[PDB]
C-alpha cells in the first residue's frame, strides 16, 4: 500500500459511505410513511 493508493481508497469508500447513507435516508423516510 502506498500513500497514493490509500488516497484513492479513502476517496472511494468515503463516496460509498455518502452513497449508502443518502440511500438509508430515502429508505428511512419511506419506511416511516409506510407506518403513518
Amino acid at each position: 500500500l502506498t500513500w497514493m493508493e490509500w488516497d484513492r481508497e479513502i476517496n472511494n469508500y468515503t463516496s460509498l459511505i455518502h452513497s449508502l447513507i443518502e440511500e438509508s435516508q430515502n429508505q428511512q423516510e419511506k419506511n416511516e410513511q409506510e407506518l403513518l
Binding site: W6, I10, Y13, I17, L20, I21, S24, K30, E34
Partner: protein, 34 residues
C-alpha cells in the same frame, strides 16, 4: 421488505466505515513508522 432492506443498508454503511477505519489505522502506523 422496507425494514429488511434498511437493515442491509445500515450493515453496508458499517462495513464501509470499517474499511475507512482500517485505512486510517494504516495511515497512523505509516506516520508512526516514520
Amino acid at each position: 421488505s422496507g425494514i429488511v432492506q434498511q437493515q442491509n443498508n445500515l450493515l453496508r454503511a458499517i462495513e464501509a466505515q470499517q474499511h475507512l477505519l482500517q485505512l486510517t489505522v494504516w495511515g497512523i502506523k505509516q506516520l508512526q513508522a516514520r
